[PDB]
Amino acid sequence: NLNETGRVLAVGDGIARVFGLNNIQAEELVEFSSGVKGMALNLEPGQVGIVLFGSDRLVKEGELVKRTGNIVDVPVGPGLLGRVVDALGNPIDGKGPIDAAGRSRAQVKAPGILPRRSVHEPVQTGLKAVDALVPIGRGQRELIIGDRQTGKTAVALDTILNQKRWNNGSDESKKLYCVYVAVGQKRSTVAQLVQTLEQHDAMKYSIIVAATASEAAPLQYLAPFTAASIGEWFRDNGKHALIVYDDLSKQAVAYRQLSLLLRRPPGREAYPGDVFYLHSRLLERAAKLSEKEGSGSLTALPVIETQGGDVSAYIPTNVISITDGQIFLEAELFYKGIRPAINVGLSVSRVGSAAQVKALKQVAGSLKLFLAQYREVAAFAQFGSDLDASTKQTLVRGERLTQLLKQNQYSPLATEEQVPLIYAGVNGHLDGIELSRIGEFESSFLSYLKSNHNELLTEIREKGELSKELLASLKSATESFVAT
C-alpha cells in the first residue's frame, strides 16, 4: 500500500528520496524501519524528499518508510522545567520521561494584530548597562550581537540568573520562566552551562533545548522552533517566558545545509531564498498578549555572531531588521575594560522606558545622551588642546559614568541597588573621586546603604518609583557618604 508507506530510492548526506507515501502531508513526521526519524520537505511528482533527524548510516535503498500522520510537534508544559531535551523534546539529561501537558507543533502562527498589548513590564537583567540604557520589556525581542568571544552568552546568562529574585516568590505574575536554546554548540559547552545554572539554583526554572554540533542539520534547524512552542505554553497560559536563541547564525547555516542537500536552488551566499523568513516567523512568535488572551508574554534574546565586526553582513542585517533593538558587543571595548562590552552609541531598546522601573528611569534621565556628549567631547580632546570648565566637567563625569557601568560576570544587581549608583553618577556626586576608586565605591556605598539607609532601599524595591521626598532623602544619603 503506497499511500501510508513508501520505499527508499536513494539515500545519502542525511537526505532520503522516497517513492510512494501518496497521502503524506508537507512537513509530516515519518518513521524509517531501520530506526531513525525524518521530516517530509519536498513533495514532488515521483518521490518525496525527506530530511533525517539522525544518522543515515543505517538506511538503505528499498527500506520501508512509514507515515505518522503528524506535522512535526513536541511535548509542552511545566513538566519540562529543570530538564534538558533535544530538538524533538526527548530528554537527554538521563532523568527519565518528561511529563507533558500536551503537544504543540514546531511551526506555529504568531499572534496577529488583535490579541496583543503594548510591552510595559521590565525584564530585569540586573546588568547596570542594559537596565539603564537599553531596557528590555516582557514580550520584546532584543538581539545580542557581536564577534566571537565578546560576551554574548554572558548577557543572557546573567539575565536568567537574575530571575532568582522573583522565581522563589509565590507571585506567578512577576515570575519569568527561562528557555535556553543551544544550536550548533558543543556538548561540553552546554554541559558547562547547565552546571553553572545548577550552582546558582537557576535550573529549576529553566528549560534547555539542545541541538549541538554533532546532531543532524535538520535538528539544528528545528530546535529554535520547538523551543518556541515550549516557551509558548507559558505565554498562552498567563505566565511569562524568556527564550534565548544561541545562536541564529548557526541555525541559518543548518537550514542552508538541509536546502542544498534537498537540491533547492540557493540564494545569496548560498543560503535559501527565504532565510529571512526563517527568522522572522521565529521571532514574531515572541509577543505580549492582550488581557482577553490572559496577558502572558514571551521575550526573545536571539544571538547573532558577526565576523570581523561586520554588522552589515547578510544574516545580521536580516535579524537586526526583525528585532525591537540590539545590544552590540565589541572586542575593543572588552579589552579596554568595558564589560559587558556594550557599544552604547549603536545599542538601542525600542520599547525603551515604557518597560523600565520608574526609579531607574528617574535617575537615568539623559544618561544615554550625556554619554554621547562624553563620546563627542573625548573624541575632540584627542587633539591635545587645553580645555574649559564645560569640556573638562563632562569629560570628568562621562569618564566616571563609563566606569560605574563596568560589572563582573554572574553578579547581577537588584533595581534598588542600581538606582543609587546611577543617581550618584548622573547628578555628579562621583565627579570628585579618583577614577581607580569607583569600583570600591560601588560596594562600600551599597554596604553603607544596607546598614544605615535600608528603609530607603525597601521603598525603592516595593514602590518602584521615587516621590519628591525619596529623592531628597537619597540626595542627603549620598552626600553623607562622599566624605567617608
Partner: protein
Amino acid sequence: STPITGKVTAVIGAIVDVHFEQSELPAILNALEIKTPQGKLVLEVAQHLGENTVRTIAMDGTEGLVRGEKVLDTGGPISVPVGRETLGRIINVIGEPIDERGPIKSKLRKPIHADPPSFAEQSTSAEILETGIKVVDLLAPYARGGKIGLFGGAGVGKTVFIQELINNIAKAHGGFSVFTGVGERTREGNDLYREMKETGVINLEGESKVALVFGQMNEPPGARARVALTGLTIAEYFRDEEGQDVLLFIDNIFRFTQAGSEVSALLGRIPSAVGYQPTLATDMGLLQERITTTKKGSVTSVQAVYVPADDLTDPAPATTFAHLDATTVLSRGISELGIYPAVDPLDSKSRLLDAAVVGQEHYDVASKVQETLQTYKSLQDIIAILGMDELSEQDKLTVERARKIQRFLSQPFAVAEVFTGIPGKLVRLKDTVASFKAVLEGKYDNIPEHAFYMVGGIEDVVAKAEKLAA
C-alpha cells in the same frame, strides 16, 4: 457554481504545483483555493509549466498539504472589498477581515491586479503639501497628490516619521486614508490600531476615515508579495469611483521586492545582481505606476523605504528613487549625533524646490542653507586634523552658522514624545523660511548652539537662549 478542479502535484515550501484537466487551465494571476481543517488556503497562479500543470505561490503556510488534494479555481484574481465599507476595518492580503468585527458587507469586490493609468491619463501639478516639519518644508517640500518616499537604514526613524505625517496631514485632510503594513512588525500594527481609536480616526460605533491593511513579517513571502496590491486597490477605488483626495501610507515598500526575492529561485529563475529577482524593476513598475494621481482623482502617497545595510546603492532602494516626487533620506550619521528627525539635508530632494513653485525668497534660503551646510561638510577634514584655529575669518563664521543650522533643522515630533520627554512642535512653512533667513543674515550669531537644538521656530530659539542663561 460551475466549478473547476485540479490536484496538487508538488510542494516545495511556498511553491505549489497543480495539475488540471485538458484546456481548462486557470489564467496566470488567478486565485485558487484549498479547503484546510482550519479554514482555506489561497494559491495564486504564477506559471504555466506545460503538460497541464501550473505553478502557484501560496498565500499562507503549506505545512499540512497533501499531493492529490482538490484545488478549486475561483475564476479570477484575488479579490478585495472596496468602498466605504472598508473604512475603520483591518483587512489581510486576501480581502478577509482580520479584526473579528464580522463580514465586510461591501457592494463590490475588485481584483488586486490592475493595469496602471495610461500616459494620456496622467495629470501634472505643482501644489505644495505643508507638513509642519522644518526640514521638509524648507529644503524638499512634499507635493499634494504626489509621491513621497522615506529612505532609511534599520532603526533610523522611518516608522516614527510616517506616524508624524499621519498625525499632521491626515486630520487636516478631508478625504479618506488607506494604511498598508507590508512585511513589518505585527506589534507596530497593534499600536497603530490602538492609536487610530484614541485619536478618533477610527470610531468603531460610527464613521471612520482610514482603512487598515496588514501583511506583516510573520507571513510567508507570497502574502508579503501581494499585500501592497491589496492596499492599493482600495485606494484606487477611492481615487476613481469615489472621486476625491486619497492618502495612501505604505510601510514598508521594500518588503514587496524582498518577498518577491524570497520565492524567485524556487519559481525557476536565475538570480540577478545582489541575489535579487531578474524582474525587480518591472515588478516595481507595475506596482508603483498604479500609485498615482490621474485626471479622475488625487492620491498622495507616503512610502517608507528600507535600505539594506544602510547601502543606498542596493538595487532595491536605488530602483525606487525615480518613482518618487520627493525623497526624504534618513541617515545613521545624523541620528547618531542626536538630531531627529535624522533627515540628511543634502541628500533629500523634491521636484517642487523650484522658484516657480515656492517663490524666489524660499528658493534662495534653501540654496544658501544647503551651501552653508556643504561648506561645513567640506571643511570637516581641516577641522579633524588641524582644528578650528586654522580656518579663515569668513570660514569660521560659516562653520558657526552651519552648526546652528544643523541643530535648528531638528524638531520634536508629537509622536516621538515618549522617546524625548519634549512636547511636540509643528512649525508653519512661512515661519520656517523667515526663521532660517534671519539666521543666514547673521541676526542670531551671539546665540549659542544648544538654543537651536530640538525646538520650534525662531521665537522658541530666543526663548531657550534666555532660559539657559538664567
